[PDB]
């Protein structure tokens, strides 16, 4: 009888997370444009 080693695996609740890239943006951005012609 060849001796072996075992592990007794059991059920347990696991979570699954994902790493994703990405950039940040302004919530409410507004560049001004002059709407009129002068100096």
């Amino acid at each position: 009888t060849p001796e072996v080693g075992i592990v007794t695996l059991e059920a347990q609740t696991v979570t699954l997370n994902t790493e994703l890239p990405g950039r940040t943006n302004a919530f409410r951005i507004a560049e001004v444009r002059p709407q009129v012609n002068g100096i």
Binding site: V4, G5, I6, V7, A11
Partner: protein
């Protein structure tokens, strides 16, 4: 993460992976290979 195929509470092997073939009677000893506890 085993999707489907392996039962809960069902023992698998860690030591002696070269020493056995399917169809050979073995003995069970708690393996000191897995680093968890």
């Amino acid at each position: 993460l085993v999707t489907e195929g392996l039962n809960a509470g069902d023992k698998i092997i860690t030591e002696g992976l070269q020493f056995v073939q399917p169809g050979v009677e073995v003995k069970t000893v708690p393996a000191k290979n897995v680093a968890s506890a």
